[PDB]
Design a protein around this motif. Structure first.
Motif, mmCIF file in Angstrom:
data_model
loop_
_atom_site.group_PDB
_atom_site.id
_atom_site.type_symbol
_atom_site.label_atom_id
_atom_site.label_comp_id
_atom_site.label_asym_id
_atom_site.label_seq_id
_atom_site.Cartn_x
_atom_site.Cartn_y
_atom_site.Cartn_z
ATOM 1 N N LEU A 159 -0.368 -3.759 8.590
ATOM 2 C CA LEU A 159 -1.276 -4.573 7.787
ATOM 3 C C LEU A 159 -0.474 -5.410 6.797
ATOM 4 N N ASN A 160 0.415 -4.739 6.064
ATOM 5 C CA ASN A 160 1.285 -5.376 5.076
ATOM 6 C C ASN A 160 2.121 -6.514 5.655
ATOM 7 N N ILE A 205 0.820 -1.215 0.000
ATOM 8 C CA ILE A 205 0.000 0.000 0.000
ATOM 9 C C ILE A 205 0.856 1.268 0.000
ATOM 10 N N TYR A 212 -8.636 5.502 10.576
ATOM 11 C CA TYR A 212 -8.375 6.132 9.283
ATOM 12 C C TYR A 212 -9.625 6.306 8.432
ATOM 13 N N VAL A 222 -7.861 0.095 11.223
ATOM 14 C CA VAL A 222 -7.918 0.998 10.072
ATOM 15 C C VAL A 222 -9.376 1.387 9.789
ATOM 16 N N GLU A 278 -0.036 2.025 10.534
ATOM 17 C CA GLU A 278 -0.953 0.883 10.567
ATOM 18 C C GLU A 278 -0.996 0.106 9.250
ATOM 19 N N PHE A 279 -0.753 0.800 8.138
ATOM 20 C CA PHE A 279 -0.742 0.178 6.811
ATOM 21 C C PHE A 279 0.500 -0.686 6.596
ATOM 22 N N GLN A 280 1.615 -0.281 7.199
ATOM 23 C CA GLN A 280 2.834 -1.091 7.210
ATOM 24 C C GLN A 280 2.598 -2.361 8.026
ATOM 25 N N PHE A 288 -7.387 -2.054 -1.018
ATOM 26 C CA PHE A 288 -6.780 -0.876 -0.400
ATOM 27 C C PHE A 288 -6.005 -0.042 -1.421
ATOM 28 N N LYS A 289 -5.627 -0.673 -2.529
ATOM 29 C CA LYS A 289 -4.874 -0.016 -3.596
ATOM 30 C C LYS A 289 -5.801 0.566 -4.662
ATOM 31 N N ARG A 333 -0.534 4.176 1.072
ATOM 32 C CA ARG A 333 -1.131 4.986 2.144
ATOM 33 C C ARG A 333 -0.241 5.176 3.374
#
Lengths: 200, 200
Positions: free
Chosen positions: A93-94, A83, A142, A138, A89-91, A198-199, A85
């Motif tokens: 998630l990844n 992602i 977010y 998220v 939190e997105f890191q 998400f992308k 974004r």
């Protein structure tokens, strides 16, 4: 009473016909072409459909080793589903996603030992719990800009997770490892869907 | 190096192609028609052959219960394979043959208990020994009028008997009962061949 064709043709309608009907959903062209191809073939030689179906069943080990390979492969190119974004939190998630996808992809080599495998079940359950844990965070903080079909995917992931657990508990009754590799592979695809949603 | 097509197509050449080549032997018409039908289908949707093969594998219980039924059925009409020849040893052949064909046909209901089944293995071995015992006696005393391809069938019966024993000893390694029902059924067909060769 209440009415032809010989008993050796049974598998054509019991096995092949339900295949074609679920196939007309995805590609009518092929499904139709195969349907009448088998029908003509059975009128020619009665029992031929069975002979065909038996030969396919005999290549079980080939199909098992193929699905095994397919599951291991289905962890490659994770950089495709990262992602843009910002930020923390997105890191997370990844990571939780990659972690889970890998743990799953390595099942065909862990399912041999019962000691290693019972640990992997605990290990996957932990990765799923921590995966959903991250998703909801998220979903709470977010602002969901442009999209919120993510919620549908989150529900879809859950459906494939409980299905994984169900076939897993079926493995300790059947011994059919192939269903585990298919279900595990399915769950990776679901993980990928969330990430891509998400992308896109 | 040393050279295309995606990995999901693998089962088309690994599973389907060997089916068609062994099918061109019995009916080229159908084998050819199905060959190109699948080829076109895979060019359309990559991986479709796998989806097809997976759906067929899922109907394992259907195919098992079908072959079970097929084996039980394959003892009916024994009056079709009775010899006109006089007198005593041919009646004995007919008995030893019928006996064996029945013992075999009732395997799908005996294979559940391990106690009943280990007895059936002993029981089949006895019927085969007494079957060949009777055959050789006709081969020694009675003048083989008009025919003696019977010797070929006697050798063919043996080949299918040792193959039955081999798949039987494989069952205590695989757990795949289907192979036992197929092999048993095959052996009944061989028994029928000998009997009909005494007639025709």
């Amino acid at each position: 009473x209440x009415x032809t064709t010989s008993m050796v043709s049974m598998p054509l309608y019991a096995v092949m016909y339900p295949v074609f009907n679920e196939l007309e959903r995805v590609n009518l062209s092929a499904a139709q072409t195969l349907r009448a191809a088998f029908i003509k073939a059975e009128k020619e030689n009665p029992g031929l459909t069975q002979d065909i179906i038996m030969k396919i069943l005999e290549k079980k080990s080939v199909e098992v080793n193929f699905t095994e390979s397919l599951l291991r492969m289905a962890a490659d190119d994770v950089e495709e589903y990262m992602i843009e974004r910002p930020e923390p939190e997105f890191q997370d998630l990844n990571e939780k996603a990659r972690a889970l996808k890998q743990i799953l992809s390595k099942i065909p080599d862990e399912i041999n030992d019962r000691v290693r495998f019972l640990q992997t079940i605990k290990d996957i359950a932990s990765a799923i719990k921590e995966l959903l844990d991250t998703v909801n965070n998220v979903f709470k903080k977010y602002q969901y800009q442009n999209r919120r079909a993510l919620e549908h995917q989150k529900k879809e992931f859950v459906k494939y997770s409980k299905s994984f657990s169900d076939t897993l508990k079926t493995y300790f009754k059947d011994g059919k490892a192939i269903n585990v590799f298919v279900s595990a592979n399915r769950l990776i695809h679901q993980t990928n869907l969330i990430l891509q949603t998400f992308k896109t």
